[PDB]
Symmetry: C3
Subunit: 293 residues, 3 copies
Amino acid sequence: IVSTIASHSSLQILLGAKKEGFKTRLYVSPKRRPFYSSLPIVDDLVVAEEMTSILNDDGIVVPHGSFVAYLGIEAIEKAKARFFGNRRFLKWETTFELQDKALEGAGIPRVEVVEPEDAKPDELYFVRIEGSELEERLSPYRVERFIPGVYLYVHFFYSPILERLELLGVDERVLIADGNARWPVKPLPYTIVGNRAIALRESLLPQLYDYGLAFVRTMRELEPPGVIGPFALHFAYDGSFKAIGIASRIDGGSNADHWYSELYWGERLSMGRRIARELRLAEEEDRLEEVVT
Amino acid sequence: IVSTIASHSSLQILLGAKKEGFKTRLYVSPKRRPFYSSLPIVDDLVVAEEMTSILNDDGIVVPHGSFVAYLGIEAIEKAKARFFGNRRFLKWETTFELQDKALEGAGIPRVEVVEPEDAKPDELYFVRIEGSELEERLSPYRVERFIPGVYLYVHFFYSPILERLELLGVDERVLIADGNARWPVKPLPYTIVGNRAIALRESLLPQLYDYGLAFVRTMRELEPPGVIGPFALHFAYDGSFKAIGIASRIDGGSNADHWYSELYWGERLSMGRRIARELRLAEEEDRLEEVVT
Amino acid sequence: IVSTIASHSSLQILLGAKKEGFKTRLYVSPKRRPFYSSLPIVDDLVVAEEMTSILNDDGIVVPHGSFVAYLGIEAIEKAKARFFGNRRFLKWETTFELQDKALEGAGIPRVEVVEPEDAKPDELYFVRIEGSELEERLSPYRVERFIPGVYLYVHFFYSPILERLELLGVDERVLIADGNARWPVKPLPYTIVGNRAIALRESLLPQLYDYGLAFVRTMRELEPPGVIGPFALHFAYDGSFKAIGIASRIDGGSNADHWYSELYWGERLSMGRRIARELRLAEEEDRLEEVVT
Ligand SMILES: Nc1ncnc2c1ncn2[C@@H]1O[C@H](COP(=O)(O)OP(=O)(O)OP(=O)(O)O)[C@@H](O)[C@H]1O
Ligand SMILES: Nc1ncnc2c1ncn2[C@@H]1O[C@H](COP(=O)(O)OP(=O)(O)OP(=O)(O)O)[C@@H](O)[C@H]1O
Ligand SMILES: Nc1ncnc2c1ncn2[C@@H]1O[C@H](COP(=O)(O)OP(=O)(O)OP(=O)(O)O)[C@@H](O)[C@H]1O
């Protein structure tokens, strides 16, 4: 019943499914299977050179941050497989156009875009789609105002079965851009290595919830059913929140150990387990149409 | 029975109370209530422009880091409401005078104070009540020796019902002073955004426990009953501990996911839940006078 | 039955043992016993000036990172006490010779060694057994290429009773070399103060598992039974993994709150509890010879 590609957050996903009593199926490549085959959370392990076998019947596919990189956006939207939570939404985090449209539509403050009209020098900027340059600026992308100050990744789960928006965690990325923390040397790459669970100052959560609620509303318009399971808003905290992006699926920073879900449930429960519980709840109520695609 | 202001650590507090079987009441403002009303952990939700409605009968108020900012110290000490753990103690973290008196009285090493007798330049200093300056020094506060090196926030819970001091966690603040970690730019504000739970090197805990025990002793003198529930000692680890402050109530870094409590209990249990269990234990033993005010 | 020295990770160890139903015995010094005697997880508390009382019969000693510093390597290998997981292995993390031998034997990439043939200046290096210098280089050790970029400590548990390698967590050290993260000042000491649990990007785990499997294989040769319980590989992530060291016993970064174990078990379970469950499994199957020394 529950299957997905081996990478990104399939561990969290499968463990949560096997936890909710569902059966497990993982599509993995020959190089990566040694590790995953040693895991007691996988029942059916489908080894393959390519993951394009998205004809996975029977089960619900449950996407993550590797699906587009392993399969085009086209293939997925026209895929035969069942799929968890909308599916037309997945593309909304893929381009600036869609990302802006939604964030603007929700009223969420975003980092300002900068077209070559700097303040050379000592006026550095961030170049997205990364890397940051100074005055010069000479050398598909966008230029943004450089903002120093903790980057927070808020995880949400809107549930149709319960008709509520759940703020389930706040992540902080572990970038290779460290080793400067100990002793700064030169600009390093912003590639993520891992994620740190962080307990946000409580006085900021209400604001994020409002932004989240607004996001759900406009997405319900902009893309018919609009946001069924997990999603994330990415922010730069200046001391005034500016949105830098979104996650149209389980973010990844959700692999970190967040609590919060304990606010809606008696038990902890991760994002991957939340998705599975959403599935199980739909089953027991003949819903299940409201959460898939 | 259990109520408190919506902010700081009311989430942790209410969840822990509802976990110990207590009833829940939250005082929240109109702007922040959307978020909190969607939480299954609140039973009675008292919306209000101002929180000055501290006539809350029936229940136990349970204070946190917002109470003085929402209500003066005067009002609270003369408040009518029941209140968890002492109450005269809450003011001891409010001024240098009280902070020093207690820390000195407990024999705890504190960061040295510096009156304009620098070592200009490259001799930077920290200015409290923040911000750090260099040589110049020109431009209610105190000047302290600048100390680089992990800032640890130790959480304690002295319980009368059990007559023991519990070391329940060690927090690390997430400041906006980051984004320098990746690439240093300029001195940033030290405002906290969140908290990270950290497993301290075990060889350092005994020392902290000793300082904690001593703190309880002198507070039992300096302020009659002295320290009934949660409190925290703030340190700068040079490789030799220097106290920089204290928390005369639930600190906030306690929102992070700490274990430790598992050393006194079979189960995890947060600080907010610890306060509630203290309450329930008192109830079942007709104590309850020993833990309130 | 289960005893060990009070420091490093004895808290984790004892709690896990008391959790698996085992009895607990802690050897502690007079100065540190106040703290440990207040802990409900210790049954028999053996106070002593020196820990050289390694004649501990009845129980299984379970070593950690303080054993060699409290007792020589000689004494331990010829010790009378029972001891958990091999014991001849414990010395393999003690010297470069052994560390290299093993890492080379497993085909694990290691940080390159540098003999005075720098690139003075701005070409800084790390000096192990710490501290980092620049061009000059003038002033038992080794010199390594300086590498900036998150240091990861992977925790493993090879179990004979189950004949499998378990990747149970990834730690990140909290060094005093911080306070530079907020605002860089001067090169600080790399002494650890604590540990942060980190959820590693899932695409990197398979690679570490492979290195781990290989480590087990060669250790099974290089040191007869080779690696029975916990061990750790230390890396520098450049974006291409370079080994900097190993832990021939429970690492310490295992005191942090890791999940992962939930992949092999339905429950969380720490490393200290993992060692204890290994013991209990052996008991129930008359094995117990396969996991002790
Ligand atoms: N406007 C900005 N100013 C300064 N730094 C920034 C800015 N935007 C992003 N960053 C840096 O990059 C990090 C966030 O990267 P981000 O999560 O946006 O990458 P990404 O969009 O997920 O990459 P991809 O689109 O390929 O998945 C932060 O840690 C931050 O330090
Ligand atoms: N003596 C010092 N030297 C260098 N940095 C310091 C010093 N004291 C504090 N800091 C910095 O500030 C942070 C601690 O701030 P702190 O917790 O003392 O603020 P605060 O007292 O809680 O503010 P408030 O009193 O309004 O609640 C640390 O992260 C540290 O980097
Ligand atoms: N090759 C290197 N280049 C740059 N920094 C390094 C290098 N090796 C180690 N470090 C720094 O030191 C830290 C790792 O220290 P490490 O864990 O190797 O000490 P240690 O070997 O455990 O000390 P001990 O042997 O006494 O137990 C990292 O945080 C990293 O910043």
